[PDB]
């Protein structure tokens, strides 16, 4: 009952009956102040853009191992048509600045076992690691379609051919997942909770973002404990997410992209 929580955002509302609270990364919220690096008065407080956008993320099966994960580049994950007015406004602006409030959903039963780590990370590598090809605009910022394995990111992944890889011991896109818990996060333990609630402020190398070139935040869902269940229990276990851009700011109005 203290675990029943409702959250309104524009014309949308998330509801959960097993919340463990909302974690505020860095104990900060994006307040929506205009970037001091822009002279033009920003476009803001667009109610049609300050809502939750819900999307399906993945299917969790018994084959996923600890640290296999799924990445959701932001704001790009919502820069497509399904991003509604946030997207259509974003595409027509040079710069955007915002925070994120997110809830990832995933229910099992009292007879299933397993757990996920739900976290937000700034400057978290979202490029593909199954190839030695340089990441490009249309491949670097895409939501993972398949679970990513973990071994090849511990020391990073150089965009060089397999034989050169031998003489490259470390790449700057390395991610020591044993410490992924140092990022603002929550754990989705099947026996405890079917939802995780996070919120992070705006962080970047600069006042506002030229988003077309940079996915500054990444929502990541990684399994910590493999999914387990006995013969007879529901086999389809899926993961979903409600993503809300917090008080976004737009500057530099222009014609649309693509």
């Amino acid at each position: 009952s203290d675990r029943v929580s409702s959250d309104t955002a524009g014309n949308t509302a998330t509801n959960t009956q097993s919340t463990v609270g909302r974690l505020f990364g860095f104990g900060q919220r994006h307040k929506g102040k205009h970037p001091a690096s822009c002279a033009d008065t920003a476009t803001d407080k667009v109610l049609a853009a300050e809502r939750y956008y819900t999307i399906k993320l993945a299917s969790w099966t018994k084959t996923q191992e600890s640290f296999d994960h799924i990445r959701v580049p932001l704001p790009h994950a919502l820069a497509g048509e399904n991003g509604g007015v946030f997207s259509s406004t974003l595409r027509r602006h040079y710069l955007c600045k915002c925070g994120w409030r997110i809830q990832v959903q995933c229910n099992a039963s009292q007879f299933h076992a397993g757990s996920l780590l739900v976290f937000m990370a700034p400057e978290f590598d979202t490029s593909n690691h199954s190839t030695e090809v340089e990441p490009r605009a249309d491949t670097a910022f895409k939501v993972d379609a398949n679970w990513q394995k973990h071994a090849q990111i511990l020391t990073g992944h150089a965009y060089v051919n397999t034989t050169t890889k031998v003489n490259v011991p470390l790449a700057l896109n390395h991610q020591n997942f044993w410490q992924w818990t140092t990022y603002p996060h929550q754990i989705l333990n099947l026996r405890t909770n079917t939802t995780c609630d996070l919120e992070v402020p705006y962080v970047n190398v600069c006042p506002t973002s030229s988003w077309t070139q940079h996915a500054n935040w990444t929502l990541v869902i990684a399994v910590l404990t493999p999914l387990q269940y006995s013969q007879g229990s529901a086999t389809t276990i899926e993961i979903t997410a409600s993503i809300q851009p917090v008080k976004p700011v737009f500057n530099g109005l222009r014609h649309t992209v693509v």
Binding site: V20, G21, L23, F26, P73, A121, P122, E123, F124, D125, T126, S127, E134, P135, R136, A137, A140, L154, T155, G156, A158, Y159, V160, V166, N167, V168, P169, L170, A171, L172, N173, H174, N176, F177, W178, Q179, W180, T182, Y183, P184, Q186, I187, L188, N189, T192, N193, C196, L198, V203, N204, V205, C206, P207, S210, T212, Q213, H214, A215, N216, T218
Partner: protein, 252 residues
């Protein structure tokens, strides 16, 4: 006692929570970020075979250039760039041994321990000659993203590097102690610098090397005069943001 890690945060306990014990804390402040990074660590090496009174021309010799990019992150000549640029990975200098030295320049202590996503600081640089032969050298410091000006001498027998208003240093003689040190302010147009990765491109057609931020450095150092010089960085008034994972270490 019991708790719930799914909250994303659990209490920091001491022995008194579950047992008959007392807190045992003693004051200590050597863990402060400012204090920790406020010390000099080897971060680069430079080599020149040109005299002081000559035209500076970019060169490489066994993985050592006569100029460096001021950044704790790995840097090196990238895809035949004229001057070194920030790298995205480290490589062994040797094509066979699979053991260091690396061909890339960096502050190993920073790369191996930078549990933050962004940092801000001033940079204290120390340049030291590797042998005892009397030093005779000229160094030019170029602010972050400023013109390198790799031009000809405008006057005969003068060090082209000194032909600038950019901050430069000239040390020579029997009375000197073969080193140079100075501190430069943060000069990047970025508010804070990415300490490990930059999840994006640096130009508008997204054709740059993904992973490297635009102008994420403290400028460059160009050198002329004979010798091999080691470089140290010391991070003044250091400030870090957003905790993140450290480099992984092989399991014992």
């Amino acid at each position: 006692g019991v708790d719930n890690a799914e909250k994303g945060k659990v209490s920091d306990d001491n022995a008194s929570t579950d047992f008959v014990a007392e807190p045992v804390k003693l004051p200590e402040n050597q863990t402060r970020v400012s204090f920790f990074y406020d010390r000099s660590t080897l971060s680069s090496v430079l080599q020149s075979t040109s005299d002081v009174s000559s035209k500076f021309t970019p060169s490489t010799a066994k993985n050592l250039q006569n100029s460096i990019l001021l950044t704790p992150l790995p840097s090196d000549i990238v895809n035949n760039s004229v001057l070194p640029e920030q790298e995205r990975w480290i490589s062994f200098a040797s094509p066979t041994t699979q053991k260091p030295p690396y061909k890339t320049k960096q502050d190993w202590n920073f790369i191996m321990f930078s549990p933050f996503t962004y940092y801000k600081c001033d940079l204290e640089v120390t340049l030291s000659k590797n042998d005892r032969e009397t030093i005779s050298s000229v160094v030019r410091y170029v602010p972050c993203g400023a013109p390198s000006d790799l031009s000809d001498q405008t006057m005969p027998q003068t060090p082209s590097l000194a032909d600038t208003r950019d901050p430069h240093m000239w040390v020579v003689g029997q009375g000197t102690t073969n080193q140079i040190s100075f501190v430069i302010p943060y000069t990047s147009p970025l508010s804070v610098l990415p300490s490990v990765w930059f999840n994006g491109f640096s130009n508008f057609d997204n054709s740059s090397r993904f992973g490297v931020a635009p102008n994420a450095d403290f400028g460059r150092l160009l050198l002329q005069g004979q010798g091999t010089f080691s470089v140290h960085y010391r991070y003044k008034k250091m400030r870090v943001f957003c905790p993140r994972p450290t480099v992984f270490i092989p399991w014992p």
